Each structure stands twice: as structure tokens, then as C-alpha cells.
Design a protein around this ligand. Structure first.
Ligand SMILES: *[C@@H]1O[C@H](CO)[C@@H](O[C@@H]2O[C@H](CO)[C@@H](O)[C@H](O)[C@H]2NC(C)=O)[C@H](O)[C@H]1NC(C)=O
Ligand SMILES: *[C@@H]1O[C@H](CO)[C@@H](O)[C@H](O)[C@H]1NC(C)=O
Lengths: 214, 215, 204
């Protein structure tokens, strides 16, 4: 049996740039190697076979090389349709025909600070006995970001859930929501609710708050 | 053209079994080998096994022996994957593909995938709450809380507001899903004009319109 | 040492599974078997006398029983007798062009025998097919199993056979009274692979 690993796990690159991704087999697979591209929500498509031969209908900006245990897929002059995930698979000897873990290729763009918005619980939710406080961190880049909640000035970690979008198809930014879920009674025991976003674009957090007393 | 048409999404309880299908057109499955591949959410591809429909012979990855049973019906040009004793680790997209092991260049044709979700949760409609603020464009939102199964869809003004919309992926909270959607509009647009989020949860036959009103 | 309880399992290659198989493939959907981890005694084949064709390319029979290879592949199918000549490097014809194509630098053996007793029927054997129409020639060792309707005119076929719209496979329809060149022949192509890898197929 042969185990397959890929590097890097994820990579960001600009349109027009050239990138190289790597596949490593645990033993010599003698060029019996295929590469696939997978776009979000679609099935994989074959790109390269026998390590270096392009499949029908694949642009020549893709090139495969390598030998033995180490193989490379190079993409020259990246185009928007190239962003997605890439997988390798070996066909050496006998099944299993194992796949690598994948490499996700994302778009690199200029850094951008988040636009932060905070929202108190709706009266409708409070009438039902609950209270969710929501913070949107929209249209930032790169994807790494930290959010801190403070209630009456004290940090709150429990009850917080975060969700990131995939990269936006228009401006290549990310967005994230952070939700603090409380009971109505707990919400009504405190006054000021704050979300603080820290992002590589500044050492100072972006802070948004409201006071339940108005 | 070659097509591999897979059966639809399945939602099943732990311990149950499910049988997925792949119907080929453009070639006869008896003339090749049909393979199945698993892809767990946000995870990689895993080869399950294959069948030779011409004589019934199968091969499996050892980790799927017993869990997976591949069969074929050449008369209807259909291959099947039966998964038994289901657990949450079996939640995944399953793909069928064609590959004649020692001849073909790679797995050239794939089905569209079939989503299998294994869960003991019950179908539950969402609660839908407005997100209104307590210089600049204005950001509004909708909180869609406590539903099962996925998915929900969110639009704004029935699609009239398409730019500046972000819908966040659902997350599990208390073993139900929650998501939110945001829309950013000019301050001259809201609240002068109505802004409504339109939420659909087809699994519960739920359609909710929620107008975002100023606080 | 002589261990019987757990013996050495690496024995003569199972050529019988290939040559003496009851079912043989159609040439358009030709069968491949990988032969590995065995001793290739080719003299069971060499001096068999039951073959009509035994042609070797880049290798010599009687020398096959020596030396090692990484793997051997055995392709098998049925064609008519007058088409066996097309199973050779550099040939042309419906079989070489649209069904089974050997590379120019082929190293291996092409073996055939008349199978009229097994593969013909009074009412015609309709199980063996070949591809009659294709938009281009096959590359070496390419295998086309498409059943798409071939557009032979200016009118589209939309998946239905009709005028100028042909199902691409045709039956041989072998009958036992056919002349020898129209009789069915079973064919086995042994291709020898040599990589910079451990040899698994060696002679005695
Ligand atoms: C089992 O028997 C096989 C065949 O005799 C052995 O493999 C051969 O080993 C000799 C050296 O002893 C080589 O010269 C041959 O080329 C080998 N042939 C093949 C096809 O591998 C094998 O070593 C034996 N195994 C054991 C454990 O004794
Ligand atoms: C095929 O079978 C015949 C007898 O029916 C036998 O003589 C011959 O050796 C067999 N061929 C192989 C390759 O085993």
C-alpha cells in the first residue's frame, strides 16, 4: 500500500502568479500519479495523468513533473477559474488507489480591515425567552481574525460561535459572524455588550458596542 | 456523452442502512469497473472499492469491508453502494466513477455526488429574527436559529437586493443549526424603503418573510 | 528447510486463467489482466502447437524462459481471422484504428488461435462486437467503450439511430460455415513492462 500526502495544505496566490504544489508518496510510485481539480460543490475533474501528461481539455498552463516519491503540479499565470482544491492519486501496483489530502488554492489580494457591526437581540427573540447578540466582521483580508466579546468590560468566552464565509467571488474578501447566545434573564443582568475584532491590518482592535439601557 | 447520474440526498438515523445508486449513460457498465469514493465534509477523498459488473467481482479498501457493499444491475446500467450500520462518521458525499484499473489514465468521469447525513435529530423549522442596528452604509441582518436539517436559503427583497449580501455557513448550536445573513445598503435606502429577508427551509415546508424595522 | 505447513506460494504464472478462460471479451472492450509475482514458464505456450499465430516483438520465444520483468499484462479479445494481422505494431485497419492499437515500440507477444468451435453459432454469435465508426484513431492501448450515436451526416442524432446516425458497434455474427478468415480467433497480447523497480515476473 502507498500513502499520499500533499503540501501546502492551503496557499494564496494572485491572478497571473505561478504556483507549485507538491504530492509525496510513501514509496516509489514510478510516475503512476494523477492530479485532479475540485471546485466547491462539484465533483473532481482529472487534470494530469502519468505525472506529466495533461488530460484532454486541460489548459497548458498546468504542468506536472516529478519522479519516485515526489511530484509537483505547477500552474503558470493563474486564472480565476483555477482557484479550488487539488488532489493527487496513485495507481501503482494494486488498490487501494489512494488520494492525497488535498491542497486548497485561494486568491491573494490586498489586505483589508473588517467592517464591524453589532446587533442586540430582537424584541421577538426576547419575548421567546432568548437573547442572541450578533457581530458581523465583513469584507476583510487575509482570513485570520480574532474576535473578543466583552460584557460590562469583562471578557466572555462561553456561548460564542463563529462562522466564516468562503472567499467572496467578487472582491476576494472574507467575512465572519460571531454570535453570543444568552438567556433573556442573563442578557438583562448586564448593560454594555462589545465585540472587538483584531486583524493583521492594525495592532488596535476595531470595537463596536451597545448598551441595553439605550 | 458519458454521464453518471447519482441518486438523491439521504438523511438517515444512526444504525440504519442506505443504498445509493449511479445510473450510467453513454457506455455499458459491464465494459468497465465502477468505483465509489467518499468525501467527508471539509475533508479529503477516500477510495471505497470497485465492482466489475461483468462478473460481479468486487474489491474494497480494508477500512470499508463490511460497511460497504457494491453491487450492479447491468440490465438497467446501474451500480449501487449499500452502507450498513450507519454512524456519524459515514456522513459524507459519495461519488461514483469509472476506471478500468490497468488501462485508463485516471478517473475521468464522475457522478455529481450523493450527500448522506446520519443524525438522530428531528426535522425542526427555524426561528427567524431581525438584526437591526441599535457614516455610511447600513448593515442589516437576519438570524435563522434552531433548524434541522440543512439547508436554509436566505434572499433579500426576493432577490432585488443582491449586492452586499453575505450568508454565513450554518453552525451547530445545541444540536440544531443556526446561521445568519447580512445585507449592506445605502443609508438613503433603509429605512426609507422596506428591506425584508426571505427565509426558506424546504425540509419543514417553511417560508418566512421578516421585515427589518428600525428599533 | 522444507516447510509444508506454510509453503512458498510464488509458483508458475496462471496463463491458464487467460488463455483457457471460458468467456472472452469483445475487441472494443478488450480485457486486461495483470500478471505479477510468479514464475513465467513460457514453454507451456511456446511448444503448444495449438496456436495459429505466435509472433514476438523485441523478445524471442525460448529466451522468454529467462530474465525478469516488472509485470506482464495480458490483453484478450476475439476478432475475425483476417484481422489478426492488424494486431501488430504499425498496422492499419478497423481493428488497429478503432479498437485495439499496439505501440510502435511494443515489446511482447501476440498469440492467436481459431475458436470457431466455441464462438460461432448457426444463428450467429452476436455477443462479439467491434467499433466501426470513430472520429479519430485510437492511441496505443487506448480503450473506447462509448456507445454514443455517430453523426455520419449534417443532421444531429439526438441519441437516436437513423439516417446518417449510426450505433458505433457492429456484431461479427460468426457462423460455423464461414471461411477461415471470417471465423472467430481468440487473441492474447502479452506486453512486458520493465521499470526501474523490483522484478516480479521471472522465468524458471
Ligand atoms: C519462493 O520461490 C520463488 C521461486 O523459486 C523465489 O523467487 C525467486 O528467487 C530466486 C533467488 O532465490 C531468484 O533468482 C528468482 O528471480 C526469483 N523469482 C521470482 C519470480 O521472484 C522466492 O525467493 C521464494 N521465496 C522464499 C521465501 O523462499
Ligand atoms: C489450456 O488447456 C489445455 C487443455 O484443455 C492445456 O493443454 C493447456 O496447457 C492449457 N493452457 C494453459 C496456458 O494452461
Amino acid at each position: 500500500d502507498i500513502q499520499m500526502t500533499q503540501s501546502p495544505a492551503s496557499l494564496s496566490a494572485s491572478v497571473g502568479e505561478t504556483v507549485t504544489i507538491t504530492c509525496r508518496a510513501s514509496g516509489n510510485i514510478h510516475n503512476y500519479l494523477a492530479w485532479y481539480q475540485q471546485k466547491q460543490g462539484k465533483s473532481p475533474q482529472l487534470l494530469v495523468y502519468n505525472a506529466k501528461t495533461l488530460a484532454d481539455g486541460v489548459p497548458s498552463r498546468f504542468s506536472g513533473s516529478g519522479s519516485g516519491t515526489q511530484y509537483s503540479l505547477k500552474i503558470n499565470s493563474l486564472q480565476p477559474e483555477d482557484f479550488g482544491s487539488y488532489y493527487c492519486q496513485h495507481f501503482w501496483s494494486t488498490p487501494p488507489w489512494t488520494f492525497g489530502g488535498g491542497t486548497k488554492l485561494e486568491v491573494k489580494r490586498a489586505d483589508a480591515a473588517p467592517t464591524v457591526s453589532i446587533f442586540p437581540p430582537s424584541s421577538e427573540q426576547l419575548t421567546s425567552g432568548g437573547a442572541s447578540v450578533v457581530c458581523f466582521l465583513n469584507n476583510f483580508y487575509p482570513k485570520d481574525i480574532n474576535v473578543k466579546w466583552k460584557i460590562d468590560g469583562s471578557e466572555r468566552q462561553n456561548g460564542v460561535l463563529n462562522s466564516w464565509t468562503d472567499q467572496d467571488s467578487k472582491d476576494s474578501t472574507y467575512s465572519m459572524s460571531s454570535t453570543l447566545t444568552l438567556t433573556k434573564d442573563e442578557y438583562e443582568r448586564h448593560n454594555s455588550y462589545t465585540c472587538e475584532a483584531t486583524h493583521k491590518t492594525s495592532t488596535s482592535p476595531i470595537v463596536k458596542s451597545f448598551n441595553r439601557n439605550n | 456523452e458519458v454521464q453518471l447520474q447519482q441518486s438523491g440526498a439521504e438523511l438517515v438515523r444512526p444504525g440504519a442502512s442506505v443504498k445509493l445508486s449511479c445510473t450510467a449513460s453513454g457506455f455499458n457498465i459491464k465494459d468497465t469497473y465502477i468505483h465509489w469514493v467518499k468525501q467527508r465534509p471539509e475533508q479529503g477523498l477516500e477510495w471505497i472499492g470497485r465492482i466489475d459488473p461483468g462478473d460481479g467481482d468486487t474489491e474494497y479498501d480494508p477500512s470499508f469491508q463490511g460497511k460497504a457493499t457494491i453491487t450492479a444491475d447491468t440490465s438497467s446500467n446501474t451500480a449501487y453502494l449499500e452502507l450498513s450500520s450507519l454512524t456519524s462518521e459515514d456522513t459524507a458525499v459519495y461519488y461514483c466513477t469509472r476506471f478500468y484499473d490497468y488501462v485508463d489514465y485516471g478517473m475521468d468521469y464522475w457522478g455529481q455526488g450523493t450527500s448522506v447525513t446520519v443524525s438522530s435529530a428531528k426535522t425542526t423549522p427555524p426561528s427567524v429574527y431581525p438584526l437591526a442596528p441599535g457614516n455610511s452604509m447600513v448593515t442589516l441582518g437576519c438570524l435563522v436559529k434552531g433548524y434541522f436539517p440543512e439547508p436554509v436559503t436566505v434572499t433579500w427583497n426576493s432577490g432585488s437586493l443582491s449586492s452586499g449580501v453575505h450568508t454565513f455557513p450554518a453552525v451547530l448550536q445545541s444540536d440544531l443549526y443556526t446561521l445568519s445573513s447580512s445585507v449592506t445598503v445605502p443609508s438613503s435606502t433603509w429605512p426609507s424603503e422596506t428591506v425584508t429577508c426571505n427565509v426558506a427551509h424546504p425540509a419543514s415546508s417553511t417560508k418566512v418573510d421578516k421585515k427589518i424595522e428600525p428599533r | 528447510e522444507s516447510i509444508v505447513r506454510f509453503p512458498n506460494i510464488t509458483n508458475l504464472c496462471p496463463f491458464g486463467e487467460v488463455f483457457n478462460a471460458t468467456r472472452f471479451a469483445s475487441v472494443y472492450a478488450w480485457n486486461r489482466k495483470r500478471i505479477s509475482n510468479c514464475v513465467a514458464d513460457y514453454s507451456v505456450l511456446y511448444n503448444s502447437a495449438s496456436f495459429s499465430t505466435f509472433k514476438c516483438y523485441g523478445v524471442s520465444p525460448t529466451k522468454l524462459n529467462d530474465l525478469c520483468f516488472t509485470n506482464v499484462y495480458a490483453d484478450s479479445f476475439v476478432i475475425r481471422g483476417d484481422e489478426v494481422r492488424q494486431i501488430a505494431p504499425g498496422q492499419t485497419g478497423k481493428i488497429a484504428d478503432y479498437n485495439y492499437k499496439l505501440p510502435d515500440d511494443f515489446t511482447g507477444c501476440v498469440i492467436a488461435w481459431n475458436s470457431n468451435n466455441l464462438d460461432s453459432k448457426v444463428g450467429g454469435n452476436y455477443n462479439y462486437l467491434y467499433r466501426l465508426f470513430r472520429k479519430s484513431n485510437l492511441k496505443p492501448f487506448e480503450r473506447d467503450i462509448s456507445t454514443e450515436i455517430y453523426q455520419a451526416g449534417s443532421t444531429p442524432c439526438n441519441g437516436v439511430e437513423g439516417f446518417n446516425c449510426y450505433f458505433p458497434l457492429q456484431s461479427y455474427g460468426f457462423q460455423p460455415t464461414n471461411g477461415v478468415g471470417y471465423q472467430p480467433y481468440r487473441v492474447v497480447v502479452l506486453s512486458f513492462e520493465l521499470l526501474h523497480a523490483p522484478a516480479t515476473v521471472c522465468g524458471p
